[PDB]
């Protein structure tokens, strides 16, 4: 809930992070928008 | 002449309450701007 220069696993970007309610399956690391741009991520240190 | 007019305004009201396609002149002008923007967002997925 602040704007940040985030980087997960080398997927660098800029944005405000938030608690999602998407259910990524165990094999999925990233969720994508209609523009092939990442709009959700699972954190690699806590699996939320 | 008043009864025919009042009845014809009644037929307009019921016709507009019944068919969808008559306003297609306006709905198509909304659909074309929406489709043009959906296409412009999709092009952010092209590798070029
Ligand atoms: C010119 O056209 C008029 C129709 O737009 C027409 O009016 C219609 O006249 C008939 C009787 O001749 C009416 O028929 C109904 O009459 C009563 C109910 O009011 C019922 O008992 C009958 O069963 C029947 O349903 C129409 O209601 C009436 N329509 C309107 C809008 O008034 C004129 O008679 C025509 N004039 C001439 C000079 O031909
Ligand atoms: C990462 O660190 C925490 C705190 O030390 C630890 O509890 C957790 O097990 C670690 N994460 C993984 C994926 O093991």
d(CA A42, CA A29): 6
Neighbour count for residue B9 (Cβ, 10 Å): 10
Cα B24 to Cα A26: distance, rounded to the nearest angstrom: 46
Asked if the C-beta of A36 comes within 8 angstroms of chain B's C-beta atoms, the answer is yes
- How far is B29 from A19, CA to CA, in rounded Å? 38
A34 interfaces chain B, CB cutoff of 8 Å:
yes
Q: Is the CB of B4 under 6 A from ligand 1?
A: yes
CA distance A5 to A16: 9
- Partner residues linked to B45 by β-bridges: none
Structure determination technique employed: cryo-EM
Closest alpha carbon within chain A to B44? A35
Resolution of the experimental structure, in angstroms: 3.1
Q: B17 C-alpha vs ligand 1 centroid, how far in Å?
A: 26
d(CA B8, CA B15): 10
The Cα–Cα gap between A43 and A20 comes to 12
In the three-class reduction of DSSP (H, G, I as helix; E, B as strand; rest coil), residue B48 is classed as coil
DSSP A30-47: EEE-TTS-EEEE--SSS-
CA-to-CA dists, residue B8 to B2, B4, B24, B35, B40, angstroms: 10, 6, 22, 37, 45
Cβ-Cβ pairs closer than 8 A, A with B, add up to 11
For residue A12, what are the β-bridge partners?
A: A7
């Amino acid at each position: 809930n602040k704007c940040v220069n985030f980087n997960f696993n080398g997927l660098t970007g800029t944005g405000v992070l938030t608690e999602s309610n998407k259910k990524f399956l165990p094999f999925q690391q990233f969720g994508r928008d209609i523009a092939d741009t990442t709009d959700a991520v699972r954190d690699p240190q806590t699996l939320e | 002449i008043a009864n025919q007019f009042n009845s014809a305004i009644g037929k307009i009201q019921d016709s507009l309450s019944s068919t969808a396609s008559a306003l297609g002149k306006l709905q198509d002008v909304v659909n074309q701007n929406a489709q043009a923007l959906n296409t412009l967002v999709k092009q952010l997925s092209s590798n070029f």
